[PDB]
Short mmCIF file of C-alpha atoms and ligand atoms in Angstrom, two decimals:
data_model
loop_
_atom_site.label_atom_id
_atom_site.label_comp_id
_atom_site.label_asym_id
_atom_site.label_seq_id
_atom_site.Cartn_x
_atom_site.Cartn_y
_atom_site.Cartn_z
CA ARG L 66 19.94 23.29 4.87
CA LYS L 67 18.71 21.33 7.91
CA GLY L 68 15.80 21.39 10.30
CA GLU L 69 14.11 24.78 10.53
CA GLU L 70 16.42 26.13 7.79
CA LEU L 71 14.41 24.22 5.18
CA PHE L 72 11.33 26.23 6.11
CA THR L 73 12.63 29.81 5.89
CA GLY L 74 10.40 30.43 2.87
CA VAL L 75 7.73 28.93 0.66
CA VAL L 76 8.20 25.21 0.12
CA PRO L 77 6.56 23.09 -2.59
CA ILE L 78 4.55 20.13 -1.29
CA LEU L 79 3.68 16.76 -2.80
CA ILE L 80 1.10 14.56 -1.11
CA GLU L 81 0.19 11.08 -2.24
CA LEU L 82 -2.30 8.84 -0.49
CA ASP L 83 -3.15 5.26 -1.29
CA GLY L 84 -6.33 4.21 0.47
CA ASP L 85 -8.50 1.20 1.04
CA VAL L 86 -11.72 1.56 2.99
CA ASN L 87 -13.92 -1.52 3.51
CA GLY L 88 -12.20 -2.83 0.40
CA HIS L 89 -12.83 0.34 -1.63
CA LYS L 90 -9.52 1.44 -3.18
CA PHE L 91 -8.62 5.00 -4.23
CA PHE L 92 -5.62 7.22 -4.76
CA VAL L 93 -5.28 10.93 -4.04
CA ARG L 94 -2.51 13.25 -5.19
CA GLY L 95 -2.07 16.73 -3.69
CA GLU L 96 0.26 19.56 -4.65
CA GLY L 97 0.82 23.10 -3.43
CA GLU L 98 2.96 25.15 -1.09
CA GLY L 99 3.54 25.75 2.62
CA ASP L 100 4.96 28.74 4.49
CA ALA L 101 5.95 27.76 8.01
CA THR L 102 6.84 31.33 8.99
CA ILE L 103 3.12 32.15 9.00
CA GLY L 104 1.84 28.57 9.46
CA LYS L 105 0.07 28.46 6.12
CA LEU L 106 -0.79 25.75 3.57
CA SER L 107 -2.35 26.08 0.14
CA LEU L 108 -3.09 22.72 -1.56
CA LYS L 109 -5.17 21.14 -4.32
CA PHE L 110 -5.95 17.41 -4.22
CA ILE L 111 -7.21 15.17 -7.05
CA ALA L 112 -8.80 11.76 -6.59
CA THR L 113 -7.08 10.10 -9.56
CA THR L 114 -9.24 6.96 -9.33
CA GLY L 115 -12.58 8.76 -9.77
CA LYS L 116 -15.22 9.74 -7.18
CA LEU L 117 -14.00 8.94 -3.65
CA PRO L 118 -15.81 6.26 -1.62
CA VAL L 119 -15.36 8.45 1.49
CA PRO L 120 -16.02 12.16 2.15
CA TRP L 121 -13.05 14.48 1.46
CA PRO L 122 -13.17 15.96 4.97
CA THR L 123 -12.37 12.52 6.52
CA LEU L 124 -9.02 12.57 4.67
CA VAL L 125 -7.88 16.08 5.65
CA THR L 126 -5.89 15.21 8.80
CA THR L 127 -4.24 12.30 6.97
CA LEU L 128 -3.37 14.42 3.99
CA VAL L 129 2.39 18.06 7.09
CA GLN L 130 2.76 19.42 10.60
CA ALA L 131 6.26 20.72 9.90
CA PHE L 132 4.48 23.69 8.32
CA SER L 133 2.95 24.70 11.67
CA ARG L 134 4.01 28.12 12.90
CA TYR L 135 6.21 27.68 15.95
CA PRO L 136 6.86 31.15 17.44
CA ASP L 137 10.41 31.96 18.34
CA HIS L 138 10.14 31.16 22.01
CA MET L 139 8.87 27.71 20.98
CA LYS L 140 11.34 26.79 18.32
CA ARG L 141 13.15 24.47 20.69
CA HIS L 142 9.95 22.39 20.76
CA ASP L 143 9.55 21.89 17.00
CA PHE L 144 10.03 18.13 16.58
CA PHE L 145 8.64 18.12 13.04
CA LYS L 146 11.11 20.52 11.42
CA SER L 147 14.05 19.14 13.41
CA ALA L 148 13.62 15.73 11.70
CA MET L 149 14.11 17.25 8.24
CA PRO L 150 15.35 16.62 5.61
CA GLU L 151 15.52 12.87 6.44
CA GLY L 152 12.02 13.12 7.85
CA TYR L 153 9.68 11.22 10.11
CA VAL L 154 7.08 8.50 10.09
CA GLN L 155 3.60 9.59 11.10
CA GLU L 156 1.02 6.96 12.22
CA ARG L 157 -2.46 7.27 13.36
CA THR L 158 -5.49 5.44 14.58
CA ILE L 159 -8.68 7.40 13.85
CA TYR L 160 -11.94 6.27 15.45
CA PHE L 161 -15.09 7.64 13.83
CA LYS L 162 -17.76 7.71 16.50
CA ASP L 163 -20.51 5.15 15.88
CA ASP L 164 -18.61 3.99 12.78
CA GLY L 165 -15.39 2.61 11.31
CA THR L 166 -11.69 3.20 11.93
CA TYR L 167 -8.83 4.60 9.83
CA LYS L 168 -5.34 3.25 10.28
CA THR L 169 -2.68 5.38 8.60
CA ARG L 170 1.08 5.30 8.03
CA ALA L 171 3.03 8.04 6.35
CA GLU L 172 6.55 9.18 5.58
CA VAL L 173 7.12 12.91 5.60
CA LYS L 174 10.46 13.97 4.21
CA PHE L 175 12.24 16.10 1.64
CA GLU L 176 12.74 14.73 -1.84
CA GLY L 177 14.97 17.35 -3.40
CA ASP L 178 13.36 20.75 -2.85
CA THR L 179 9.93 19.22 -2.33
CA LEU L 180 8.41 18.27 1.00
CA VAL L 181 6.68 14.97 0.31
CA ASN L 182 3.99 13.19 2.29
CA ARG L 183 3.37 9.62 1.14
CA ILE L 184 0.52 7.87 2.93
CA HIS L 185 -1.04 4.44 3.13
CA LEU L 186 -4.54 4.35 4.61
CA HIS L 187 -6.75 1.48 5.79
CA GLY L 188 -10.39 1.85 6.65
CA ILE L 189 -12.20 -0.91 8.50
CA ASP L 190 -15.61 -1.73 9.95
CA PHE L 191 -17.45 1.18 8.32
CA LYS L 192 -21.26 1.12 8.09
CA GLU L 193 -22.66 1.17 4.58
CA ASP L 194 -25.40 3.57 5.57
CA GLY L 195 -23.27 5.58 8.00
CA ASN L 196 -22.07 9.19 7.61
CA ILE L 197 -18.86 8.20 5.91
CA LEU L 198 -19.86 5.62 3.26
CA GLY L 199 -23.24 7.36 3.07
CA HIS L 200 -21.52 10.67 2.27
CA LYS L 201 -23.49 12.63 4.86
CA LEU L 202 -20.63 14.90 5.95
CA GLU L 203 -20.65 18.59 5.00
CA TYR L 204 -17.87 19.83 2.75
CA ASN L 205 -16.16 22.00 5.31
CA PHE L 206 -13.89 21.85 8.32
CA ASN L 207 -13.69 23.18 11.85
CA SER L 208 -10.96 24.45 14.18
CA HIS L 209 -9.17 22.12 16.59
CA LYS L 210 -6.43 21.75 19.19
CA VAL L 211 -3.77 19.05 18.64
CA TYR L 212 -2.08 18.00 21.90
CA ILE L 213 1.59 17.05 21.56
CA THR L 214 3.87 15.27 24.05
CA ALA L 215 7.40 13.83 23.81
CA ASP L 216 8.08 10.12 23.36
CA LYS L 217 11.68 9.77 24.53
CA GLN L 218 11.77 5.98 24.16
CA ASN L 219 10.98 6.17 20.44
CA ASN L 220 12.93 9.42 20.00
CA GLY L 221 9.70 11.06 18.87
CA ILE L 222 6.35 12.49 19.89
CA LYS L 223 2.78 11.40 20.51
CA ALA L 224 -0.31 13.45 19.73
CA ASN L 225 -4.04 13.17 20.40
CA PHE L 226 -7.08 15.24 19.37
CA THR L 227 -10.72 14.97 18.35
CA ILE L 228 -11.94 16.22 14.99
CA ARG L 229 -15.50 17.54 14.73
CA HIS L 230 -17.15 16.82 11.36
CA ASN L 231 -20.38 18.68 10.59
CA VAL L 232 -23.08 16.27 9.45
CA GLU L 233 -25.69 17.39 6.88
CA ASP L 234 -28.48 17.12 9.48
CA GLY L 235 -26.78 19.50 11.90
CA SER L 236 -25.23 16.77 14.03
CA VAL L 237 -21.50 16.48 14.60
CA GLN L 238 -19.45 13.41 13.75
CA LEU L 239 -16.48 13.06 16.09
CA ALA L 240 -13.24 11.41 15.01
CA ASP L 241 -10.73 10.60 17.74
CA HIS L 242 -7.11 10.78 16.58
CA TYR L 243 -4.20 8.95 18.20
CA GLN L 244 -0.84 9.80 16.72
CA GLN L 245 2.78 8.73 16.88
CA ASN L 246 5.75 10.20 15.08
CA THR L 247 9.24 8.75 14.84
CA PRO L 248 12.32 10.09 12.99
CA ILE L 249 13.54 8.29 9.85
CA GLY L 250 17.22 9.16 10.34
CA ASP L 251 19.44 8.45 13.37
CA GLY L 252 19.33 11.47 13.51
CA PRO L 253 19.14 13.74 16.59
CA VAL L 254 15.84 15.60 17.05
CA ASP L 255 14.02 18.15 19.19
CA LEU L 256 11.95 16.45 21.89
CA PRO L 257 9.31 18.96 23.04
CA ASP L 258 7.70 19.89 26.32
CA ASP L 259 3.93 19.44 26.26
CA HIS L 260 2.20 21.91 23.97
CA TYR L 261 -0.54 22.10 21.36
CA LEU L 262 -1.26 23.13 17.78
CA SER L 263 -4.20 25.37 17.06
CA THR L 264 -5.71 24.63 13.67
CA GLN L 265 -8.09 26.27 11.21
CA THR L 266 -9.01 24.96 7.73
CA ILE L 267 -11.17 25.91 4.70
CA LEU L 268 -12.28 23.38 2.05
CA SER L 269 -13.18 24.85 -1.32
CA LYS L 270 -13.41 23.83 -4.97
CA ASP L 271 -11.66 24.71 -8.20
CA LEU L 272 -14.40 26.05 -10.50
CA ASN L 273 -12.40 24.93 -13.55
CA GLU L 274 -11.87 21.36 -12.27
CA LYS L 275 -14.10 18.46 -13.34
CA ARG L 276 -12.35 15.69 -11.43
CA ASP L 277 -13.33 14.88 -7.85
CA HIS L 278 -11.12 17.24 -5.93
CA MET L 279 -10.45 19.33 -2.86
CA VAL L 280 -8.87 22.73 -2.48
CA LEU L 281 -7.47 23.33 0.99
CA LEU L 282 -6.32 26.36 2.95
CA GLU L 283 -4.94 25.85 6.43
CA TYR L 284 -3.46 27.95 9.23
CA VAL L 285 -1.80 26.27 12.22
CA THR L 286 0.08 27.84 15.13
CA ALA L 287 1.86 26.17 18.04
CA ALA L 288 1.14 27.45 21.53
CA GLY L 289 1.07 26.52 25.19
CA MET H 280 -1.52 -2.97 -30.94
CA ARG H 281 0.62 -5.77 -29.87
CA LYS H 282 -2.02 -7.72 -27.90
CA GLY H 283 -2.71 -11.01 -26.16
CA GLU H 284 -0.48 -13.98 -26.96
CA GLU H 285 1.36 -11.90 -29.57
CA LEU H 286 3.09 -10.12 -26.68
CA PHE H 287 4.54 -13.46 -25.55
CA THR H 288 6.14 -14.71 -28.75
CA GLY H 289 9.63 -14.01 -27.43
CA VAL H 290 11.52 -13.51 -24.18
CA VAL H 291 9.84 -10.71 -22.21
CA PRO H 292 11.39 -8.49 -19.53
CA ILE H 293 9.62 -8.64 -16.17
CA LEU H 294 9.30 -6.15 -13.30
CA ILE H 295 7.76 -7.20 -10.01
CA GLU H 296 7.20 -4.93 -7.01
CA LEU H 297 5.62 -6.07 -3.75
CA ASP H 298 4.68 -3.82 -0.87
CA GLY H 299 4.08 -5.95 2.21
CA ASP H 300 2.84 -5.66 5.78
CA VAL H 301 2.75 -8.78 7.94
CA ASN H 302 1.66 -8.43 11.59
CA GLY H 303 2.81 -4.83 11.30
CA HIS H 304 6.20 -5.73 9.88
CA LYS H 305 6.66 -3.79 6.66
CA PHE H 306 8.85 -4.72 3.72
CA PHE H 307 9.35 -4.07 0.03
CA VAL H 308 10.50 -6.52 -2.64
CA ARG H 309 11.60 -5.80 -6.22
CA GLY H 310 12.23 -8.56 -8.74
CA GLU H 311 13.58 -8.32 -12.28
CA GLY H 312 14.19 -10.93 -14.96
CA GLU H 313 12.64 -12.58 -18.00
CA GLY H 314 9.88 -14.96 -18.99
CA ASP H 315 9.45 -17.16 -22.06
CA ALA H 316 5.86 -18.38 -22.31
CA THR H 317 6.59 -20.64 -25.29
CA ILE H 318 8.45 -22.99 -22.92
CA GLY H 319 6.76 -21.79 -19.76
CA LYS H 320 9.95 -20.49 -18.17
CA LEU H 321 10.68 -17.73 -15.65
CA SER H 322 14.10 -16.53 -14.56
CA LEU H 323 13.93 -13.94 -11.80
CA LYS H 324 15.97 -12.22 -9.11
CA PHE H 325 14.30 -10.55 -6.09
CA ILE H 326 15.79 -8.08 -3.63
CA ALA H 327 14.35 -7.08 -0.24
CA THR H 328 15.11 -3.36 -0.49
CA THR H 329 14.07 -2.79 3.13
CA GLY H 330 16.48 -5.33 4.63
CA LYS H 331 15.96 -8.80 6.08
CA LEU H 332 12.40 -9.99 5.43
CA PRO H 333 10.16 -10.66 8.41
CA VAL H 334 8.76 -13.71 6.59
CA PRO H 335 10.43 -16.57 4.67
CA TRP H 336 11.10 -16.04 0.96
CA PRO H 337 9.15 -19.21 0.05
CA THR H 338 5.95 -17.76 1.53
CA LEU H 339 6.06 -14.95 -1.09
CA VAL H 340 6.79 -17.05 -4.12
CA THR H 341 3.22 -17.47 -5.32
CA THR H 342 2.56 -13.73 -4.86
CA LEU H 343 5.69 -12.57 -6.67
CA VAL H 344 2.90 -13.91 -13.53
CA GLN H 345 0.76 -16.78 -14.82
CA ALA H 346 0.62 -15.29 -18.30
CA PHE H 347 4.04 -16.95 -18.75
CA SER H 348 2.61 -20.41 -18.28
CA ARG H 349 3.06 -22.53 -21.37
CA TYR H 350 -0.32 -23.25 -22.92
CA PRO H 351 0.10 -26.08 -25.49
CA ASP H 352 -1.66 -25.87 -28.87
CA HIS H 353 -4.75 -27.74 -27.69
CA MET H 354 -5.01 -25.41 -24.67
CA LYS H 355 -4.47 -21.95 -26.20
CA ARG H 356 -8.19 -21.18 -26.10
CA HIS H 357 -8.16 -21.53 -22.30
CA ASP H 358 -5.43 -18.93 -21.80
CA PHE H 359 -7.30 -16.11 -20.00
CA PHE H 360 -4.04 -14.62 -18.72
CA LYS H 361 -2.46 -13.77 -22.10
CA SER H 362 -5.78 -12.76 -23.68
CA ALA H 363 -6.13 -9.91 -21.18
CA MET H 364 -2.88 -8.33 -22.22
CA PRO H 365 -1.65 -5.69 -22.69
CA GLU H 366 -4.25 -3.99 -20.42
CA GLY H 367 -3.87 -6.84 -17.97
CA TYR H 368 -5.71 -8.26 -15.00
CA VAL H 369 -6.19 -7.86 -11.26
CA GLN H 370 -5.08 -10.93 -9.31
CA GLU H 371 -6.41 -11.30 -5.77
CA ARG H 372 -5.75 -14.04 -3.22
CA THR H 373 -6.48 -15.17 0.27
CA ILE H 374 -3.71 -17.57 1.49
CA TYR H 375 -4.29 -19.44 4.76
CA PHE H 376 -1.21 -20.89 6.30
CA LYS H 377 -2.62 -23.82 8.28
CA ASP H 378 -2.52 -23.27 12.05
CA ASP H 379 -1.07 -19.82 11.39
CA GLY H 380 -1.67 -16.45 9.75
CA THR H 381 -3.23 -15.30 6.50
CA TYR H 382 -2.03 -13.36 3.45
CA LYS H 383 -4.40 -11.07 1.59
CA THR H 384 -2.99 -9.93 -1.75
CA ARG H 385 -4.17 -7.76 -4.61
CA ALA H 386 -2.04 -7.36 -7.69
CA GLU H 387 -2.10 -5.70 -11.09
CA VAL H 388 -0.39 -7.62 -13.87
CA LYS H 389 -0.07 -5.70 -17.13
CA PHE H 390 2.30 -4.36 -19.78
CA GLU H 391 4.07 -1.06 -19.25
CA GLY H 392 5.83 -0.40 -22.52
CA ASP H 393 7.89 -3.50 -23.36
CA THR H 394 7.81 -4.77 -19.76
CA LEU H 395 5.38 -7.10 -18.09
CA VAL H 396 4.81 -5.67 -14.66
CA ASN H 397 3.42 -7.32 -11.54
CA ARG H 398 2.57 -4.76 -8.83
CA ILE H 399 1.43 -6.24 -5.52
CA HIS H 400 0.09 -5.12 -2.17
CA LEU H 401 0.19 -7.73 0.58
CA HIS H 402 -1.40 -7.90 4.02
CA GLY H 403 -0.51 -10.62 6.52
CA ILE H 404 -2.69 -11.05 9.61
CA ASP H 405 -2.88 -13.30 12.68
CA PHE H 406 0.58 -14.87 12.41
CA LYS H 407 2.13 -16.53 15.47
CA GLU H 408 5.43 -15.13 16.77
CA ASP H 409 6.86 -18.61 17.29
CA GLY H 410 5.19 -20.17 14.25
CA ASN H 411 6.75 -21.47 11.06
CA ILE H 412 6.55 -18.14 9.24
CA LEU H 413 7.55 -15.47 11.80
CA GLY H 414 9.86 -18.08 13.31
CA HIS H 415 11.58 -18.63 9.94
CA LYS H 416 11.37 -22.43 10.19
CA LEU H 417 10.62 -23.01 6.49
CA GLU H 418 13.30 -24.53 4.25
CA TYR H 419 14.67 -22.40 1.38
CA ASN H 420 13.17 -24.50 -1.43
CA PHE H 421 9.89 -25.14 -3.24
CA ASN H 422 7.75 -28.08 -4.34
CA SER H 423 5.65 -28.98 -7.39
CA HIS H 424 1.96 -28.15 -7.32
CA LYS H 425 -1.28 -28.27 -9.28
CA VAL H 426 -3.14 -24.97 -9.76
CA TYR H 427 -6.80 -25.63 -10.57
CA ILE H 428 -8.36 -22.96 -12.77
CA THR H 429 -12.03 -22.42 -13.44
CA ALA H 430 -13.94 -19.75 -15.36
CA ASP H 431 -15.86 -16.96 -13.68
CA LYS H 432 -18.40 -16.11 -16.37
CA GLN H 433 -20.22 -13.56 -14.22
CA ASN H 434 -17.09 -11.47 -13.71
CA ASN H 435 -15.56 -12.27 -17.07
CA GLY H 436 -12.59 -13.78 -15.25
CA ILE H 437 -11.22 -16.86 -13.57
CA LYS H 438 -11.07 -18.43 -10.13
CA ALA H 439 -8.32 -20.73 -8.88
CA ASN H 440 -7.68 -23.01 -5.93
CA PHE H 441 -4.60 -24.91 -4.74
CA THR H 442 -2.48 -25.87 -1.75
CA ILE H 443 1.19 -25.06 -1.51
CA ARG H 444 3.39 -27.50 0.41
CA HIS H 445 6.21 -25.74 2.27
CA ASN H 446 9.00 -27.96 3.66
CA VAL H 447 9.56 -27.28 7.36
CA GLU H 448 13.05 -27.60 8.88
CA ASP H 449 11.93 -30.46 11.11
CA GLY H 450 10.86 -32.63 8.19
CA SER H 451 7.19 -31.67 8.48
CA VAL H 452 5.14 -29.83 5.83
CA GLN H 453 3.44 -26.44 6.19
CA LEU H 454 0.42 -26.24 3.89
CA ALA H 455 -0.84 -22.92 2.54
CA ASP H 456 -4.28 -22.96 0.97
CA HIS H 457 -4.66 -20.52 -1.93
CA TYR H 458 -7.93 -18.95 -2.98
CA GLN H 459 -7.55 -16.88 -6.14
CA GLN H 460 -9.64 -14.61 -8.34
CA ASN H 461 -8.62 -12.76 -11.52
CA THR H 462 -10.58 -10.10 -13.41
CA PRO H 463 -9.54 -8.21 -16.56
CA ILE H 464 -8.54 -4.56 -16.16
CA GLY H 465 -9.59 -3.57 -19.67
CA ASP H 466 -12.93 -3.61 -21.46
CA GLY H 467 -11.87 -5.83 -24.38
CA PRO H 468 -13.06 -9.42 -24.83
CA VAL H 469 -11.10 -12.23 -23.10
CA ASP H 470 -10.79 -16.01 -23.17
CA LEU H 471 -12.87 -17.77 -20.52
CA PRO H 472 -11.37 -21.27 -19.97
CA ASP H 473 -12.74 -24.73 -19.30
CA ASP H 474 -11.68 -26.25 -16.15
CA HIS H 475 -7.99 -27.12 -16.34
CA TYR H 476 -4.83 -26.90 -14.29
CA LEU H 477 -1.30 -25.53 -14.26
CA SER H 478 1.55 -27.84 -13.33
CA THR H 479 4.22 -25.90 -11.50
CA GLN H 480 7.84 -26.53 -10.60
CA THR H 481 10.17 -24.02 -8.96
CA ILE H 482 13.80 -23.73 -7.84
CA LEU H 483 14.99 -21.20 -5.26
CA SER H 484 18.65 -20.28 -5.28
CA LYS H 485 21.00 -17.47 -4.34
CA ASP H 486 23.35 -15.08 -6.05
CA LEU H 487 26.77 -15.79 -4.55
CA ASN H 488 27.80 -12.17 -5.26
CA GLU H 489 24.75 -10.61 -3.61
CA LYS H 490 24.95 -9.18 -0.07
CA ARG H 491 21.33 -8.04 0.24
CA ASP H 492 18.53 -10.32 1.37
CA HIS H 493 17.47 -11.82 -1.97
CA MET H 494 16.01 -14.76 -3.91
CA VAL H 495 16.89 -16.13 -7.34
CA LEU H 496 13.92 -17.97 -8.82
CA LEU H 497 13.65 -20.45 -11.69
CA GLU H 498 10.20 -21.63 -12.63
CA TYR H 499 8.56 -23.89 -15.21
CA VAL H 500 4.81 -24.00 -15.65
CA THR H 501 2.61 -25.86 -18.09
CA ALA H 502 -1.10 -25.86 -18.58
CA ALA H 503 -2.89 -29.16 -18.93
CA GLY H 504 -5.84 -31.32 -18.87
CU1 CU F 43 -2.49 -2.00 3.01
#
């Protein structure tokens, strides 16, 4: 099955993130399912190394855009699915306003029946008493627009957006995302006209779970 | 139950895995082979699974298992490395290549079943594009060095310092200053050594049957002094 064919039903997901922020090292594993026909994810993440040194919401965008719902008239613009099963590399720079920066590199691809997202994350120049290392971010998420454009030279796409993180004092912590994706195989892909992804996400907990963790529900639809 | 030196009485299988990123160039190296700490000997083969390395093989040598150093009878009480096993230790370094970039490394060295494993993550920053490393101007060989070890009583570990001498193709020598710190992974007691050193000698060769970018390594190390 190739491209969009791999997403004609519920697909199991494995996510693994190795992170290092200001020298603080942690690992997160996530598992669950995605249904691209309706643009839906259901995931549970565990911090296997103990309590995270950063707030869970700062990791959400790093922790599978192939599961976005692309309506039929837009299927010709679905770079993410078109790269499957071989997959794509996803890199970002994330600038937390008045604070540090995340640099991330990931491979998103099928390993057998499972869609896997393996990530390496760096965090630099974070303030010890800032919102991130100070854990002042609310455990929730907001709704965003992800702008996507083609990158013909690299046979891929670029994306940019700003995440809004609610701070415990009512303020909002912005995080500017700059994104590049490039196919792993060689490996023809869909190169899209400009469009966007509309995102909505809920962060919850598992009442039976004692480990530091995050339950995530996400709905994303392509438009424009 | 097999613990400390006891786990080095014979020839031990070794697995080494290095994930590297130098000036944005990414690579992965796996090595397999054997070590015999009674005579201080390593015999190892490394493969670059990601293709041609962006840096010379000799620059990775020190990163790619000091528990296999031969500690003579009078020195056994200074052997921090073996005493930490099987749970193992974290080994961290900063390596400054003079007039060039820097390696930052963090590794876990420990037993996994019967195998001694060395798992490493490496960052390289500020390297010059036309320098000895990114320019691949280093000879495929190695020299003999002295690794100075000192105890770190506060952290229940050890610190080390030394300078590697890398032969350059033009007859010059590229120095690489190593700064090293090791801390036990487990909560058991360990040996904290007096000041001493390790005397190192290493040969780099090739496997005439091997098509992949690779390095065969032969190493002898003895503690002294
Ligand atoms: Cu890294």
